[PDB]
Ligand binder design. Sequence first.
Ligand SMILES: *[C@@H]1O[C@H](CO)[C@@H](O[C@@H]2O[C@H](CO)[C@@H](O[C@@H]3O[C@H](CO)[C@@H](O)[C@H](O)[C@@H]3O)[C@H](O)[C@H]2NC(C)=O)[C@H](O)[C@H]1NC(C)=O
Ligand SMILES: *[C@@H]1O[C@H](CO)[C@@H](O)[C@H](O)[C@H]1NC(C)=O
Lengths: 50, 51, 153
Amino acid sequence: IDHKADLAVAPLAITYVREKVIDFSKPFMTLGISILYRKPNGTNPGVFSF
Amino acid sequence: LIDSKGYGVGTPMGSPYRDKITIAILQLQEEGKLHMMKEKWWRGNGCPEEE
Amino acid sequence: CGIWVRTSNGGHFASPNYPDSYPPNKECIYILEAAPRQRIELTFDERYYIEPSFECRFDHLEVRDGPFGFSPLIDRYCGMKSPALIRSTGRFMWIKFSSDEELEGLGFRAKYSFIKTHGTIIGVTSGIVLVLLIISILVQVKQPRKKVMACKT
Ligand SMILES: *[C@@H]1O[C@H](CO)[C@@H](O[C@@H]2O[C@H](CO)[C@@H](O[C@@H]3O[C@H](CO)[C@@H](O)[C@H](O)[C@@H]3O)[C@H](O)[C@H]2NC(C)=O)[C@H](O)[C@H]1NC(C)=O
Ligand SMILES: *[C@@H]1O[C@H](CO)[C@@H](O)[C@H](O)[C@H]1NC(C)=O
């Protein structure tokens, strides 16, 4: 804002509100949000499935 | 995926730098340095495959 | 309509029908690809010396600094002016020629300068498969020996 630095080269959301106050370059990478969760315990050991 | 946002580069307001770094960004994209560069910091260790 | 002028240190680009009127309703994208470290020198050859007092629509020639219709806009030219020469090191010029539904012109002239086999074999340790097959084949070979010996006896 105050010119006190130059272009902030950093991962930053190109958001609506900052847009009025800062200009933003054509994006270099996209974004998304995904769910994160564990793995299943595992297969049935398959030793004696009988 | 759920949503999609944007990583670009911030800049002083109305500065000519932004519009001439945009072309550089686009050039890097339409070259492909972006993808391999992305991998080079995101490669890590490959998980063994699952059925 | 388009012309690939790639990998030319120089070559010639112009409106289709250059000497005659350029065609109507034409939308042809013209592409300038310069290898990295190259500086792009466009040379534009004007056909008519007079100054238009009006910059109007219907007929425009676009210049882009990177992929067309997509990259930052350099300029939109019209009239009978030759535009001034364009020097960019963006390495990519992406140009379109337009046309309206009437009222064509002298056209324009430009120059660019650059400076079951697998099924059996593929298995978890087919080696196991082969060992089992070996055991089976060998014992099947054992059988008719005792068959013939029993027949003899
Ligand atoms: C002597 O006076 C004439 C008439 O004023 C000057 O010609 C120029 O005429 C146009 C008429 O529309 C004036 O408007 C301008 O047109 C240009 C080109 O389309 C446009 O870019 C401007 O924004 C504006 O609309 C123009 O002002 C005028 N030019 C001037 C006064 O310099 C002629 O140039 C004058 N010659 C001298 C030696 O001053
Ligand atoms: C197995 O499932 C249980 C769930 O209660 C939990 O211990 C964990 O999420 C899984 N993994 C291991 C190693 O226990």
